[PDB]
Structure formats: C-alpha cells, structure tokens
Design a protein around this ligand. Structure first.
Ligand SMILES: [Cl-]
Length: 281
C-alpha cells in the first residue's frame, strides 16, 4: 500500500518533539489548511531487505491498517499518512497532556480511586481493541497519554500501535517482544501470543499505579525476564499496606502464567473491584 508522497512540509509545520524512540520520532505539528494540531510520527524505513535497521514495510503497513480501523475515545485517531524515501510519517491525534509515565513520576502515589479512574479508561480502550481482535502487545505507562494533565481525573488514550496485531486465529506466532518489565511469560518464552498477553500487562500497570513500584524489575533485562517467566513477584507491605484486598485480588488474577487461566478483558470489567530489542548489548 502506497502513502501520500508530497512533502509533508508543504502541508504541515512542525514544532516541539514529543517522543523519540529507536526508529521513530514524534513531533507536534500544525496542518496549514485548517490550523489543527497533530502529532507527526516519523518511522524510519529499512534501506535494504536483509537489514536490521529501520522498520520493515510489512510492519509499517500493519500499524497503519490497524490504526485505520480504530475509533474510540480511549485510543488515538490516525489522520493521514505520508511517505518519502527515508520515512513513513503518520499524522496522529495530538494528546497534549503527556505520558502517564511522566505523570506518575511527577506526582507519585495514586490513591486507589485515582488508580481505578485511570485503569477503567485503559480497560475500556482494551475492551474495544480486543472486541476487534486486536492485541496491542506494548501496553505500559509510556504508551498511555493524558489529554489534559491539570484536571483531577485525567482522560487518557492508548498510543503506539507499533507491535499491534490482528489475532484472527486466537494466537499469532511472529517476532513480537515488548519491554521486559511489561511482557507476559508467553512473550518471554517465545510461545504463541494472543489477547491474553495484554491482560498480563494490565496487571503490571495496575501494580505500578497502586504502589509506584514495578513487580518484576530486576537489575538487568535478563533478570526481569527471568522473574516474569517464574511469576516472581509479591505485594510488598511497605507499598501495599493501605491497598484493599480486592485490588490485590484483581492483580493476582491477571499475573497468571497460564494464559487460559488469566482474566479476560470482559472478566476484568466484571471483577468486583471494577464493576459498578529485548537484549543487553
Ligand atoms: Cl503512536
């Protein structure tokens, strides 16, 4: 599939950089014809078929076609796509309040209600995605952004569909591996993956929201991955002493090694607490 090949600078002006990754940089931008603001994500293309640098066209097209499907308050909206010899440029909805990662770092310690307010929105977004058989495969605080960080209950959107896949056969067996702290055991063990992996990541996020600590983090990536595979985590009393038993129950039912025994997104919404690359160089 071909994208718009006109120079993006003829149609947009760019400003502040919002994110910078391995082979993707995000710049705030403004469409000249409307004055509307967006986030332009520049994805580096691969220069040769056998290269390890850049993103394969197959991977770029997958991200774009998934983004084209989705429209929901808790996920970003893709506006248009440009390309040139070096990059594919995705013009995405601007989420101006920053990453949840930074909000948590700057604020520190979310009450149980504040955690549940964020979590309910994440669950609603993932319910939408999973209903569409889309696995995100990279859920973590850095991939959730706030619309406005200066309100008591910030609204959020899930971003970064670079690892997302359609799961039309119940599982996928590809080169899929996210951030060690957040990946499920089946990712660590290179086993087929499905929607269940996202539910594990939600368990990790919930643990972090409530405590400010990461459940499986070791001093090296290999130790984190080993901890994940062994389900080597516990609720530290110093961080969880005023956290309800029902919140712990929720987490416990998500941080389950066997994907078939883990709560699904629908289970998570009915749970009583809620119901109304991977290598060191
Ligand atoms: Cl993104």
């Amino acid at each position: 599939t071909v994208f718009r090949q006109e120079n993006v600078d003829d149609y947009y002006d760019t400003g502040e950089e919002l994110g910078s990754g391995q082979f993707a940089v995000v710049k705030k931008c403004r469409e000249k014809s409307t004055g509307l603001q967006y986030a332009a994500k520049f994805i580096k293309k691969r220069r040769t078929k056998s290269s390890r640098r850049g993103v394969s066209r197959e991977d770029i097209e997958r991200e774009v076609s998934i983004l084209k499907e989705i429209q929901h308050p808790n996920v970003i909206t893709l506006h248009e796509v440009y390309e040139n010899k070096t990059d594919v440029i995705l013009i995405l909805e601007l989420v101006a309040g920053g990453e949840l990662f930074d909000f948590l770092a700057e604020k520190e310690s979310l009450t149980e209600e504040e955690a549940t307010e964020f979590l309910k929105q994440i669950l609603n977004g993932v319910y939408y995605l999973h209903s569409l058989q889309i696995a995100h495969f990279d859920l973590k605080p850095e991939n959730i952004m706030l619309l406005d960080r200066n309100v008591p209950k910030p609204r959020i959107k899930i971003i970064d569909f670079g690892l997302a896949h359609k799961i039309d056969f119940g599982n996928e067996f590809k080169n899929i591996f996210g951030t060690p702290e957040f990946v499920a055991p089946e990712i660590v063990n290179y086993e087929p993956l499905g929607l269940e992996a996202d539910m594990w990541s939600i368990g990790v996020i919930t643990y972090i929201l409530l405590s400010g600590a990461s459940p499986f983090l070791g001093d090296t990536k290999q130790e984190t991955l080993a901890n994940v595979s062994a389900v080597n985590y516990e609720f530290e009393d110093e961080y969880f002493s005023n956290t309800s038993a029902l919140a712990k129950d929720f987490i416990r039912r998500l941080l389950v090694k066997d994907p078939k025994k883990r709560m699904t997104i629908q289970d998570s919404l009915q749970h009583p607490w809620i119901k109304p690359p991977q290598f060191e160089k």
